[PDB]
Amino acid sequence: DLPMPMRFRHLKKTSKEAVGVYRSPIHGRGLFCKRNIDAGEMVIEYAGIVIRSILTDKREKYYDSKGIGCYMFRIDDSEVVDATMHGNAARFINHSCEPNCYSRVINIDGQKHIVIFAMRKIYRGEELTYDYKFKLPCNCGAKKCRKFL
Ligand SMILES: Nc1ncnc2c1ncn2[C@@H]1O[C@H](CN(CC[C@H](N)C(=O)O)CC2CN(Cc3cccc(Cl)c3)C2)[C@@H](O)[C@H]1O
Numbered sequence: 275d276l277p278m279p280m281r282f283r284h285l286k287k288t289s290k291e292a293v294g295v296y297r298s299p300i301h302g303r304g305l306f307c308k309r310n311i312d313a314g315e316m317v318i319e320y321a322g323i324v325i326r327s328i329l330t331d332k333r334e335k336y337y338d339s340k341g342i343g344c345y346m347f348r349i350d351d352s353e354v355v356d357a358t359m360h361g362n363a364a365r366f367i368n369h370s371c372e373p374n375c376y377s378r379v380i381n382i383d384g385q386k387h388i389v390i391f392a393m394r395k396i397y398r399g400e401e402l403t404y405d406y407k408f409k410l411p412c413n414c415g416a417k418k419c420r421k422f423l
């Protein structure tokens with residue numbers, strides 16, 4: 275509808291009104307919508323620090339040794355977004371084999387941002403989920419479940 279940079283500019287204030295973090299029956303805590311989200315709507319940024327992929331093993335190791343949950347989003351084989359210290363509510367988005375959301379790497383004014391889009395209209399109360407990029411069982415509960423993450 276509106277160009278990608280024109281759609282990114284409006285998020286921080288609107289995401290606070292559109293989504294919340296609560297207990298999820300899929301796993302631990304999840305992201306849920308507080309009001310209906312239109313199909314194609316830019317929901318929230320997966321906020322954090324873009325770091326080199328080779329650095330993730332040691333960073334995860336450091337966080338695990340401190341008893342701090344490690345929240346990372348895989349961009350590609352070379353970069354990852356570390357949402358552990360400088361993240362937002364998007365770090366709680368669970369995986370699903372019938373997602374209602376999808377992740378995209380956008381580039382606004384030279385800077386890379388991971389944004390979450392709604393692929394269908396999402397209704398008040400629904401949990402927001404995306405198909406994770408990647409031995410680990412899946413609890414999304416969908417009919418067409420891949421049964422592993
Ligand atoms: N469909 C699915 N079927 C089963 N498992 C699923 C799932 N989709 C998501 N997951 C699990 O979640 C992880 C992704 N996380 C998303 C938010 C998560 N729900 C959360 O409460 O923090 C962020 C991770 C960082 N970690 C901190 C943590 C570590 C141990 C226990 C707990 Cl409570 C929390 C969690 C995946 O790696 C899976 O392990």
Ligand SMILES: [Zn+2]
Nearest residue numbers: 371412414419
């Ligand atoms: Zn599934």
